[PDB]
Design an enzyme around this catalytic site. Structure first.
Site, short mmCIF file in Angstrom:
data_model
loop_
_atom_site.label_atom_id
_atom_site.label_comp_id
_atom_site.label_asym_id
_atom_site.label_seq_id
_atom_site.Cartn_x
_atom_site.Cartn_y
_atom_site.Cartn_z
N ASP A 35 0.82 -1.20 0.00
CA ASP A 35 0.00 0.00 0.00
C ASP A 35 0.86 1.26 0.00
O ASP A 35 1.35 1.67 1.06
CB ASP A 35 -0.89 0.01 1.25
CG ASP A 35 -1.79 1.22 1.33
OD1 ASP A 35 -1.91 1.93 0.31
OD2 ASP A 35 -2.38 1.45 2.41
N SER A 199 -0.71 15.65 -12.00
CA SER A 199 -0.98 15.28 -13.37
C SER A 199 -1.22 16.53 -14.21
O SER A 199 -1.74 17.51 -13.70
CB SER A 199 -2.19 14.35 -13.43
OG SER A 199 -2.63 14.10 -14.76
#
EC number: 3.4.23.22
Length: 330
Positions: A35, A199
């Site tokens: 994770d 992004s």
């Protein structure tokens, strides 16, 4: 040193991925959920409340000659989906894909919430976010990656998740056969303890690319792609019959649909998520309403590039002094 381990989806939907991990002496092999959105290595154990164990493999520190109680240390964690676990702490030898760390904090669960109990395939979590998020008190502990780092050939790990198929986590090297083209690297902020990056935009299907900064985290421990409501609305508007359902808890779409792809930007590069990756199947057994793999982050407080996004790429988690993230197509 290096390590290399195969990671395998737990079910037909790729709800999560498990990777075998050797703990203790003699080795006890547990299948852990790696994770990159948390920083605790915790396991089902001989200490876990019996009624909260249902099929998991447990770590028994009393059977390990290298286990030592970390006296006074406790841990307690709550995840974004509302699940939680807590317990005490041992140090022991932990190996992943041939890479061994001695003195690793292995957090033994005394209690786990229902979602963990109900998932018989996940024996615990191995956190790979930054160690500043580790919950051990009163002495915060380091992740497996942080402990291994100095011994690694290169201070990196890579996630290569499969779509309905096995994939690979590598430590200490970049497998240049595992991706196509070049890797594009992008800046990381560690201010919140995550692999947080920005992004450069998105496209829906064959549509034009929208240049827009989207701050979010690369999180292998989250199933879906969570993005701003504007972006998610633009995606689902291209699917006939798609709608946001408060009763179901997100966007659903007719199971008869063909989903469009979703592209996200990494600098000047583009990663394309095929439409099929966005299908999470019937909302309930036999339903013709299907759950979407792109959902709104509104009210989460952060955008999350979860497995839906990451499995479309070869992803480099670069833990150099100035960390960065790299993405390649594959």
């Amino acid at each position: 040193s290096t390590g290399s381990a195969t990671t395998t989806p737990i079910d037909s939907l790729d709800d999560a991925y498990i990777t075998p991990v050797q703990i203790g002496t003699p080795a006890q092999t547990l299948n852990l959920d790696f994770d990159t959105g948390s920083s605790d290595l915790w396991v089902f154990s001989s200490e876990t409340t019996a009624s909260e164990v249902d099929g998991q493999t447990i770590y028994t520190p009393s059977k390990s000659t290298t286990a030592k109680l970390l006296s006074g240390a406790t841990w307690s964690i709550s995840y974004g989906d509302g699940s939680s676990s807590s317990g005490d702490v041992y140090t022991d030898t932990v190996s992943v894909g041939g890479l061994t760390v001695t003195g690793q904090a292995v957090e033994s669960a005394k209690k786990v919430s229902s979602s963990f109990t109900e998932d018989s395939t996940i024996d615990g979590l191995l956190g790979l976010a930054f160690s500043t998020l580790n919950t051990v008190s009163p002495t915060q502990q380091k992740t497996f990656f942080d402990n291994a780092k100095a011994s690694l050939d290169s201070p990196v790990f890579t996630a290569d998740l499969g779509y309905h198929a096995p994939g690979t986590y590598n430590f200490g090297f970049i497998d240049t056969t595992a991706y196509t083209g070049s890797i594009t690297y992008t800046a990381v902020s560690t201010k919140q303890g995550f692999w947080e990056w920005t992004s450069t935009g998105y496209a829906v299907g064959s549509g034009t690319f929208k240049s827009t900064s989207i701050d979010g985290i690369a999180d292998t421990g989250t199933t879906l792609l969570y993005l701003p409501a504007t972006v998610v609305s633009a995606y689902w508007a291209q699917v006939s019959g798609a709608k946001s359902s408060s009763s179901v808890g997100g966007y659903v779409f007719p199971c008869s649909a063909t989903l469009p792809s979703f592209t996200f930007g990494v600098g000047s590069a583009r990663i394309v998520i095929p439409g099929d990756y966005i299908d999470f199947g019937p909302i309930s057994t036999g339903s013709s309403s299907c759950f979407g793999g792109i959902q709104s982050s509104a009210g989460i407080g952060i955008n999350i590039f979860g497995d839906v996004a990451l499995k479309a790429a070869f992803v480099v988690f670069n833990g150099a002094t100035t960390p960065t993230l790299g993405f390649a197509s594959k």
